[PDB]
């Protein structure tokens, strides 16, 4: 369109002429860093302009402005500034309107959309912004109720940061698809960090240490019940009149109850999140395993009741998975909570792509060796020779594992070539790649600790809504500001402490 | 010569005197950064000068200018500029001539020669250069047909970049001897990157995924036919009246057909490229293996037909090589395509030089131990004691593998010294060197992926010339410029999209 | 309070008005970088101010000033300067008073408190500060008695650095709780480094090399006495009339004497330091082991005398610990003294947190496998299957270690999964973490050598107080200054040499 | 002294007064950067000064000036400059004198002393210094006989660099004690690098590749003669009338001849160099081994002739050493010549200090285990249990290697503790340290290749003095300058080529 083409052309004379006589006009002008035109467009003698009018697509002026943010320091400063002048102009025209509280058709606030998009700068500013002109401090968030000097206590609005019945600032930062570029560090901002720390130290630390204790108890019960399973006859085994048998039956029913509980808590999670298959493992990997080691026990139950003795095969895998899943509860520790994150990454990246490169070698040399052997031990089987070759990779093989071969030069050449390629070369580069992975996710991922605490804190908070949803509310309904209408702004503020020396 | 000695001496008065009354005069003056003398030499009252006249060696003014480029940022800016003024002067004198289209006696254009030489700066500029003076935009390549604003769409000439019946911009960048210093990154330039990406996404992705599927099918057929080979009697085995035997014969003929196909596709490649022996492996290492694992099967065929049972020795090596060669088809993946490049480098550098350092130790201590042993088991053999010592290097040896030694202090001292030197010291430094190699070619070689896609794309494009050579042509014959003669410049342009904010 | 609120508000007019008509007034003003107010507050026409008056909490002006230091280069310069002007003002008012010699109620001097707090800048300046105004050089420490030119010899006060009957500058830097941030490098300052070097080279090198020799002799005696222990009957073994038996009895009594000596030297240390349990191992780890390997021998003695043959179990652990504790005496070497510090850190950090992550896997798969096995070898025991699984982690296991399993697919799947998770993945990331640890404490911890020499030098100095406490005093009682009272300042100075060229 | 104290005090008025009415006066003034005083002191109306007068200690003005150089960029510039003005002043006073040719009482020239001391800057300047004032170009070294332009050919004096019958510039840089700080890179200077390269490419490459071939032939002869040694009876074995026996006797006499040759070439080297014991291995480690593997064969000969059959023990070690010493001849290759330097460093630093830390553990746990075992196999021996424990460190041990122990908890606890401490912890930190060592001497030591070529080139040049000492002289006796006396300076110059563009 020409009327917007001229605006995008940085033309002021034509803009004024059109006034006399982002796809929206205001949004299109704003996104181009004209700035002064925004004020000129906002009000004009020929006709005024309105920002409250939402776009057909659903993005208002604020949504459009945050849309263009591309996480650049200069870009961050520009966008946050121009956002501030847009808010100031809106206040000047009519302070009654609440632009930020206004939302798109999809129910996303500018703060929530900034969080989901991953715009760290805009979210950081909006979360904490202090206005000094008292007549214009209504729409400020980071206050300074009292600064004694060395310490300058501050108050943060935290309206939709915690108590929000919609997508909140933390929910989006911890329950999203995890493709956002800076979710890892984006919750180190001023209010969120201390809010989550307070939540944990006050209300969630016990409810988590309790869950770990109950899980350990459940796993001990399950191990004891599985270890002492009857071995005579076919299931179901009729109860016997012994204290041990009844006590074991209690253990078994506890095991099955836990299994069904985990199955349902997994199914409800997968209906709540609807994770994409391509991102099924990357995002929620600690949630797939708790579901699978309950699927195993459900299969075990159905096999056990249907006159079958293969249920042990299922139950044993469930037991091993249940024990090895106690690394999900190390997220509550910084020092030891990074080992559960190294295994997760190495099993999915370093050990998943490297298996294709290895099974090729193993199968090639296995077929070679097995065809070389006449069989005229029973080593002619492909499985047996594929297992004898695997032992070489873990340093407990034996060169002379067969003699049915007619040719001794060729067989030993093949075996030595395999040993050199896999034991000495492939292993020593897989280990090198694991070195790089450990480097990375031990030097930069030291705050996946914080991210995992955010996820578990939100999970527990959602869990205990029935117990205390409104009561378990962070922050105090304190008075820090006054509205233009004359009412007192009672905001759910969160006290904060900070110190600075050089400023004096 | 004095007339050129004065020019090389930065003398202007003597140059003017000589005018009144790089080995070429114009080229010699140009290479010295006189610049103004180039204009002065080009035309003069006493007599004019011509640039179209090719030198006796074969380098014109443009070839000579690109010759001196030494890949320096300041040098790159200087050479590209002075190249631009040479083109402008040539246009001013007579726009009819086409200097760049002009070539040397060897058929190399300035762009092609710049590509082969490895001059990244000159090639980058010439590939994309935009002229703003409309009267002088004839010899421009990177146009801006329309810039809407945030997006500024561009057009690239791409005359000899793809559809060239001569050494093209991509052919030289992907089918050369690979001694060029920046071939790895040199195809990240504006037009080439997106041209190759479009070629792959449109026309080559299927033709490659088809080849990998057919190779997997061929290898499965070959493995099945080799695994179920008859073991009774001597070859050739007469066909039996069984479904299995006939089906196996079909498999065998497919195997031999594939073998001969690979043999011929290797021989034709080695006659097409004529690779130097010193660079036989460095450049085309994935091409030697496909040839060798076909030589093995041809040897197997000739042995099989000539009443011989050692053909199994050849066929087994062919089978193992064929299976392990499926890492050639991982070039089409970024994540897993770097494991095929780590093996290639480590087998040729880290594991080839380190074997000399190890066979010395193995042979020294083997001879020592074998002479120490009287034999008064049959361990006196040099092979047996060289194998017993090798097991120590891969952690499955045994100290007391013999007792024929008269001296127990000396034999155990030798064995412990060998174990400490090879198992604990040589292995743990070979692994460290592999660490450095993996570091390098996992941090910088992440675009050998792109380079290998360039090679395979060119290979497939040459393969399907009969199917669609002219039809499978990239770019559209679009109108972006006008020649001085008045004809419309219909150029095989390639649309491109780009965005910039700060410029405004 | 308002009178101090105004001061903290950087108000000068109100300060002057209050004068006319850190919690202390002077300290509160000083900590805020008013500086000029300190001089104004010190003396005033309306009323003067005194700094000698100690605060109720116990911090004087100097203690308060050093309290605010936060180890910042600009902060260090500011605090050291303002400290210097406070000293100068105190001298001007009345040079008779000795502020620095003055101490708090807890017996801490400003230097000692600066050392304990970890303030490197303040301690570095106070230790070496040179005054050029001769009338004001009384309270200087780093003198220049004579500077020949290229060499400028210097004298350092070293009053409480060595000969202090209180918490001294070295004692605090080497016998504290080790939570101080820069104790590692904080004793590289001018006087302390050369003082400790002189102490070692003169008086302590022999007394330490003697102790190592005596410990080696004691361990050889103990090993010989334990190796040739009687094996017939039950203890106590009655002495026999043989030279060997009597000589062994002498060895045994020497062993027990050494054991009781170590027990008491450990108990007295733990009553001297009162280390917190949370820091029991981090701080004094080389002191726990010498105590434990004496507790073992005391338990061995009490078992031996009370008609018991399990004393061998205790004595053997004591012997192994005593031999492996000879790495405590490698602190006296730079090159080999870093291996005793790598083991200390890796056993407490890399191998302590990683065991939890491993015992989970071992126990999970052990329970899985043992429940899978019917036992219908005696491998049903949990211990046997937990040991068979452990061998896999150290590369000497065997896949087919049992056959009592009914299901062969499941058992081998479990075994291969365990081998891949623990042998190939957990080990290769524990080794990577050990790589980072070794990197760190081999590149930065190369002065834990110096720190350990400081600790051992102080230990030996305290040990030999009875031999020569006053006589073994560092520095000479030399004359470098004169007091205002007219007496000659005979200070225990330590000569030092230094060279500078550029200053000229 | 006062007359020099004033000079060291930067006093000019007192210096002038003393004139009217480094320990030497001129040297003392020069070393202090007075500069102008040097000219003032050199000549004065009251009395002149002379620089040719050598000091009592033996350092002249030039030696004293180079003495103070401390390898600092600003210091290097200052010292080289002031050296140049001293030379210019000496020329002005009387060009007849040759100060640089003048030497101290010990026979060291300023260039030679600068080389030995390790002063890179002074040596670099003196080796190549160009003077432009033609009247003052006599004492210049780096000439420019003709500069065509892009290429500026240069001539270098190289008087004592190669043909010097005294300590030369290369001899000192390659046959010194190796404690010099920058010997590694100090021979990358302009003339030395190309001089050594020319020497190798022309005269030494063959004489070295010949020596390696002859050594390989000698080792093959020795291996063949030792492998087929008679086994019947006692030595000396009387010759038998067989072709094989006579041919073996020829091999044996060749072996002994080579052994005695190596013994004498080692003894003469150790009398030529007189290496200090503390630096016996650091400096010449490739020279100790060739001597030791000849001592072994001499011991073998003396045992063989004196009716003894233990000569095999000596000869076998000699054979193993001779084979493993072929890594001395990899210095002539860049790519593979760094493996012989990694072994040299790791055997002396990483594996020598780490053995003390390991033998402590091995002996402690060996004594513990052996005393724990009653023996009521023959595992009670200390050697057997020390070997069974060592196998654990190289991953081929066995937990249940004995059953004579009464206590099974304690024995297995000890074994597991040993395995965890040594196999899993000590090995994985020794490997980490080897990682650092390989990092270093593979990233910075890539020119120990050049240094070793320098040493071998000098060795071969000294070897072939009888063949062609004067004839095998580098450089041409060319004319580049003229002396003040009028004679033509025919200097043994070495042509050199260089190119520069930016200077123009
Ligand atoms: Na093994
Ligand atoms: Na191993």
From Swiss-Prot, chains A, B, C, D:
Responses evoked by capsaicin, but not by low pH and heat, can be antagonized by capsazepine. Changing residue 400 to Q: Minor modification of pore attributes. Predominantly expressed in trigeminal and dorsal root sensory ganglia. Expressed also in hippocampus, cortex, cerebellum, olfactory bulb, mesencephalon and hindbrain. High expression in the cell bodies and dendrites of neurons in the hippocampus and in the cortex. In the brain detected also in astrocytes and pericytes (at protein level). Isoform 1 and isoform 3 are expressed in brain and peripheral blood mononuclear cells. The chain holds residues 203 to 752 of 838 of the full protein. A motif (Selectivity filter) lies at residues 395-398. ATP binds at residues 8-9. The modification Phosphothreonine is found at residues 144, 456. Changing residue 324 to I: Reduces sensitivity to capsaicin 10-fold; no effect on sensitivity to resiniferatoxin. Reduces binding to resiniferatoxin. Na(+) 2 binds at residue 395. The chain crosses the membrane at residues 207-227, 246-271, 285-305, 310-330, 346-373, 410-438. The association domain (AD) is necessary for self-association. Non-selective calcium permeant cation channel involved in detection of noxious chemical and thermal stimuli. Seems to mediate proton influx and may be involved in intracellular acidosis in nociceptive neurons. Involved in mediation of inflammatory pain and hyperalgesia. Sensitized by a phosphatidylinositol second messenger system activated by receptor tyrosine kinases, which involves PKC isozymes and PCL. Activation by vanilloids, like capsaicin, and temperatures higher than 42 degrees Celsius. Homotetramer. Interacts with PIRT. May also form a heteromeric channel with TRPV3. Interacts with CALM, PRKCM and CSK. Interacts with PRKCG and NTRK1, probably by forming a trimeric complex. Interacts with the Scolopendra mutilans RhTx toxin. Interacts with the spider Tau-theraphotoxin-Hs1a. Interacts with TMEM100. Interacts with PACS2. Residues 228-245, 306-309, 402-409 are extracellular. It comes from Rattus norvegicus (Rat). The modification Phosphoserine is found at residue 276. Residues 379-401 dip into the membrane without crossing it. It catalyses: Ca(2+)(in) = Ca(2+)(out); Mg(2+)(in) = Mg(2+)(out); Na(+)(in) = Na(+)(out); K(+)(in) = K(+)(out). Belongs to the transient receptor (TC 1.A.4) family. TrpV subfamily. TRPV1 sub-subfamily. This is Transient receptor potential cation channel subfamily V member 1. Channel activity is activated via the interaction with PIRT and phosphatidylinositol 4,5-bisphosphate (PIP2). Both PIRT and PIP2 are required to activate channel activity. The channel is sensitized by ATP binding. Repeated stimulation with capsaicin gives rise to progressively smaller responses, due to desensitization. This desensitization is triggered by the influx of calcium ions and is inhibited by elevated ATP levels. Ca(2+) and CALM displace ATP from its binding site and trigger a conformation change that leads to a closed, desensitized channel. Residues 436-464 are annotated as: AD. GO terms for molecular function: ATP binding; calcium channel activity; calmodulin binding; chloride channel regulator activity; excitatory extracellular ligand-gated monoatomic ion channel activity; extracellular ligand-gated monoatomic ion channel activity; identical protein binding; intracellularly gated calcium channel activity.
